[PDB]
Every structure is written in structure tokens, then in C-alpha cells.
Amino acid sequence: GALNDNPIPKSVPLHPKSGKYFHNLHARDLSNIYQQCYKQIDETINQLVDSTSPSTIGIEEQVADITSTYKLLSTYESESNSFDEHIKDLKKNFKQSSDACPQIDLSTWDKYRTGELTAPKLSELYLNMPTPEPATMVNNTDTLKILKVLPYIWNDPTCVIPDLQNPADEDDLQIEGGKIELTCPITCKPYEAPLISRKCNHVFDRDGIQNYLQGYTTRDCPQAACSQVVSMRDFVRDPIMELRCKIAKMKESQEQDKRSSQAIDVL
Amino acid sequence: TEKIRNRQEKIERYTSDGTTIEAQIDAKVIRD
Amino acid sequence: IDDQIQQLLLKQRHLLSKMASSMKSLKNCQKELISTQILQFEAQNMDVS
Amino acid sequence: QLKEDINSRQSKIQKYKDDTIYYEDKKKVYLENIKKIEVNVAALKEGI
Ligand SMILES: [Zn+2]
């Protein structure tokens, strides 16, 4: 073996001065950037519902592309998360192994440079550090729920998708065939700020669900044939119902504007 | 011994300071 | 209005793809920067030793 | 401000805990050494 006449050792244990430097070694927290992205995508969803003409089809490709984009972005966030986790574990292991390795003096300088003493090398260990993998892909936002279901919702807005409440399971959500009512079962009114129940997936207008539960702490689900005892906290904003009602109302508004104009042309 | 005493003192001081500033920032959290 | 809107949504998906690519660059270059940073740390460790 | 506070707190607490461990180990080593030299003093006094 060609010993190091270059007294720089191949590997050295953690020197305390750089132990401090090593403390500063970390992957940057990009989760703020990802939250900004997720907020932008949610606003994109809302404005996509707001603008898209319900009489015009062809948003399925838009939603699918943004679906793939957001899955890719969540994958990147997860890669960074697993990268940070691997950095933490790698730092812990490197510190333990280096501290298990003799500290550096002239004698250990010669031993480490000649290979007599070997210590973990953060460059080498970082190469040996597990590659950033998707760790907890951020799919649990309402973003991927809409980006997944919105082609089909565009094909038919009133369709019931019963597995929109669990974005935590990253398996593809199997949409069951159904139609969610466009009228509040309580007030018999179209949804304005609809609240969905996490227990039975029945969605009611916020005013309607508040009125049904008014005067009592918890009451049964207002939808017919449902006995789920629910309260205001049990109901959370339903982006899906807002999307459905919004699309339906916009289609009706286009129809009504054309009908009202001809309705005046009659007089 | 003096060194470790100083380190522990500063650790406690700056831990308290970090918690306080974290609470302050949580307060600091927060057209048509 | 409808078709202009559909164009806007096409812009949505396109710029989202741009964001995804730039986020790939984001995460990968963050990993790269901390890689050379830990390499610098190793060199400095050897230096102070 | 949260980023700066977290970074400063982590850095300072790391520096001081590392110094705590380092100088505590040094204190233990010096106590062992003083025990050895006390044994040497006792042996020399016995020779006296
Ligand atoms: Zn329910």
C-alpha cells in the first residue's frame, strides 16, 4: 500500500472546531417553499373552478398535468425530508463513530494518514448516506384530492367520491360511483360554504348544518337515513362541494344569461 | 470546571431565549 | 370567455410543470450545496486537526 | 425571525454542550491524574 507521505489523512474523526461546523451541516428547511407551492396550487384549484366554463370540456388534461406536477413537487419535498432525516441519522452515526475513533494528535496524525487509524469520513459517509427517498409524500393536502378527482368531477360535477377524506393513504383513491346532492338536505338550498362531516361524508351548507345543530352541542346527521351524531367541529370545509356547486351555478349562470337576454327580447 | 459551568449557564440562558423568541414569532404569525 | 379560460388553465398546468421542474432543481441543488458544505467541513476538520 | 432564532439557539446550545462534555472529560482525566500524583506523593513521603 502507498502510505500517505502527504500527511493529510484519508479520514479523520470529528474535530471539535469542526464539530461546531458539523452542527451547522444540515439540509435547508424547504418546507416553507413547499407550503407556498401548496397554497398557490390550492388557489389555482379555486380559480380553475371559478373560471372554467362548465359548458366547456377539456380541463381533464389540465387537472391531470397539475396532478402529476403536484405529485412531483410532493415527491421533491419528501426527498428533501428524507434527505434531512438521513443527514440527521448520518450525523449521529458519524459523531458516534468518530468519537469512538481516537482524536487527532501527531501520533494519531501519522496513524490516520498511513491508514493505521481509520475514522468515518463525512464526505465518504455522505456518499454512503442513504439517497433521499420520498419520505411522507405531501399528498394529504386538499390539493392532490382535487387534482386527482377533478377530471371526473369536470365530466360530472355531482359525482360522489367517498374517499376524499383520507389523503394520508397514498394509494390511488378508488372513486365509488355516486352523486352528491346540489341542494342542502336541511335548508333545501344550494351549498354556499358547504361543510362535510368526517364521519358520514354527508355535506351540508355551513348555514344549514349550523342551523340543524343549533341549540344543541351534538346532533344526528341531517341527511336522510344517517344517524351520525355530529357537531360544528365535526364538520370541516368541503372543497369538493364548493367545486360542484360553483361549477353548477356557473353553468346555470351562463344558461340564465342567454335565457334572460332572449327573455327580454320577447317583450 | 469553570468552562463547563459557563457552558451550562449559557445553555440555560439561550434555551430560555430561544423559547421566548419562538413564542414571540408565533404571536408575530399575523386588495378587494 | 370559455376558450380564453381554457387557455388560462393550460397556462396553469404548464407553469405548474415549470414549478415542478424548478422544484426538482431546488431540492437537488440544496442537496448539492450541503454536499460541498460537508466536504468543506471535512477539509476544515482535517485542517484544524 | 423564527429561522434566525432557531439557528442561533441550535448553534449556541451545541457549542456549549460540546464544550461541556469535552471539559467534563478533561476534568475527569485531570482528577485521575491528580489521584495518581497523590499516590506518588504518598510513596515519596513513605520514602522520606
Ligand atoms: Zn358524518
How large is the C-alpha radius of gyration of chain D?
A: 21
Contact between chains at D20 and B11 (C-beta distance less than 8 A): yes
Rounded to whole angstroms, how far apart are CA atoms A229 and A224?
13
Contact between chains at A122 and C44 (C-beta distance less than 8 A): no
C13 min Cα distance to partner chain A (Å): 5
Rounded to whole angstroms, how far apart are CA atoms A204 and A194?
5
Expt. technique: cryo-EM
Question: Resolution, rounded to a tenth of an Å?
Answer: 8.0
Rounded to whole angstroms, how far apart are CA atoms A244 and A161?
12
**Among all residues of chain D, which has the CA nearest to that of A14?**
D18
Rounded to whole angstroms, how far apart are CA atoms A233 and A84?
35
Nearest to A76 by CA among B5, C25, D8, C1: C25
User: A197 forms bridges with which residues in the sheet?
Assistant: A235
Sign of the dihedral defined by the CA atoms of residues A160, A164, A169, A171, in that order: positive
Rounded to whole angstroms, how far apart are CA atoms A83 and C8?
36
Residue D21: count other Cβ atoms within 10 Å of its Cβ. 15
Rounded to whole angstroms, how far apart are CA atoms B2 and D20?
10
Query: Residue C46: phi, psi to the nearest 5?
Result: -60, -40
